[PDB]
């Protein structure tokens, strides 16, 4: 298939992998810090999805240095992946408009 479409799929796979690794690592980083709520895997995975999409509910977040570093990798992976899908959609529409104009 075309590059952009492939890169998108790849982006979707890496993101899913980042979500899972991120959930596991967040718990590992947060347990041990009194007050931390990002300490069980199921909600940590919900936290990972919230972070990747920047939905901003604010119901969960890391309070430790390492947890925050993990958060940044997930945010960037999410913002980048969704942004990459936008670019793929753009390349797709541009190719079609070219045809439609007989170019």
């Amino acid at each position: 298939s075309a590059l952009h479409w492939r890169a998108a799929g790849a982006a979707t796979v890496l993101l899913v992998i980042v979500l899972l690794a991120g959930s596991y690592l967040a718990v590992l980083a947060e347990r041990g810090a009194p007050g931390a709520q990002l300490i069980t895997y199921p909600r940590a995975l919900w936290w990972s999805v919230e972070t990747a999409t920047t939905v901003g509910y604010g119901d969960l977040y890391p309070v430790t240095l390492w947890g925050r570093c993990v958060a940044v990798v997930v945010m960037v992976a999410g913002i980048t992946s969704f942004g990459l899908v936008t670019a793929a959609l753009a390349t797709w529409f541009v190719g079609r408009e070219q045809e439609r104009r007989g170019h």
Partner: antibody
Amino acid sequence: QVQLQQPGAELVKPGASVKLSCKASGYTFTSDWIHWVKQRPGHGLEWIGEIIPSYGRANYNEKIQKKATLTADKSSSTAFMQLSSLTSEDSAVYYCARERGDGYFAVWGAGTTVTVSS
Amino acid sequence: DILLTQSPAILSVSPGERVSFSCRASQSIGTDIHWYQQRTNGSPRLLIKYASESISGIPSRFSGSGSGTDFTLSINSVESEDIANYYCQQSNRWPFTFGSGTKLEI
């Protein structure tokens, strides 16, 4: 079958130290945490600390003096709690429990009764 | 550290009656509260997880309710084998903590 196996007892001299063991069986996941809980005769349950074998990291109760040190052998899937410089205040039943990383202690060992005296 | 208050410390009831144990958290913890039963010389046993979820292998006369800071463990038609100590435990914030326990007496 019995998911967690602990020795029934340990006698320790005041000042000495002992290493409690907890052999686990049944399903095992990298997300498993092994906890240790202390119960003095007549009193309640006191969380001591936890450890995640799949990584070897451990956390301890900060509100109490640190008498324990946790470790785990992934091959023999056994968890250990090193208690050191014990006094009579350390005499109690020490339970180990398994948590699937979802907050609750699904299974507990029978507990090891530790007595500190000469 | 989340403080879990279990009061009264002792609860006396007649056979077959419905009984309720109380557990108050020092701050809101959603439904991240779990209940254990510990009989004489026995080790703790999970009865209810996440405030109201039944555990397979536990009699249906055991149920839980509540959210936020107030939780209740209930036993419908109490019977002799229920004689024991009951503890609540929270997993909302680190570190996990236990309540002081309530003893059931018939």
